[PDB]
């Protein structure tokens, strides 16, 4: 039996679909894990190992996270609102990152792909860090659609977790490019209702959601510091059978309280 797993059972059957969380506590090495191998669509989480991909880049690229990217129109689609509203300045390519992170902005996402060889080049970068599950194979938007069974633009609670935690505390990134993807992340605004309301008001949070919002598929992930101790990482994924099954955030939140109060 698993009786650190039956709350989880009870939250997704509740929701009407699957979740999948991993937590990892990396000062005792502690688990929670619940359908932790089992893939989810990334949805606009991708963006977050997106931005750290471009900062790999521009650790071998001198100037690359300075250069103005002068986009034309035809570069945006929807939910561009970073993109749209500084279309006739252009952006530098940490502008455009920074908006990819924490406004989840589309055609930003789109022309760092782009930069980077398209998503089949964001998934090299995903195996030099040791991540054989992660997959991007579309763009935005066709990358949301979510299909159940389809593994296309897909990865796991525990791969997610397990990179996050490369790329933010260990040393895929160099230092300076690993400080700005946990700055980047510490200021997304897109996640208030997630992993952060089920946090402590007094530890600092870094996160990146996902909202393909058809067959209730929805995300987070995050570094989360609790004062006085160190990082605990993890991922909270879900999804459902039905095209008009709704995403909950409430859920998310619930799963993420879960996780930190089965560690030790
Ligand atoms: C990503 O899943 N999306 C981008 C945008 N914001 O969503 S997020 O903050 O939950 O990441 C709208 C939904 C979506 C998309 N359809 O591109």
Redesign the pocket.
Known sequence: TNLVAEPFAKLEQDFGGSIGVYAMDTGSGATVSYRAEERFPL???FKGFLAAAVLARSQQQAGLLDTPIRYGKNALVP?SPISEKYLTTGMTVAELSAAAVQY?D?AAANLLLKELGGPAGLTAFMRSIGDTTFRLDRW??EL?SAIPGDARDTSSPRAVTESLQKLTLGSALAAPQRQQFVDWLKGNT?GNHRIRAAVPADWAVGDK?????VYGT?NDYAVVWPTGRAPIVLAVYTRAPNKDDKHSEAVIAAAARLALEGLG
């Open positions: 949805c606009s989480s939910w989840s589309n935005e938007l949301n897109t959601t996902g909202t393909c919002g929805a």
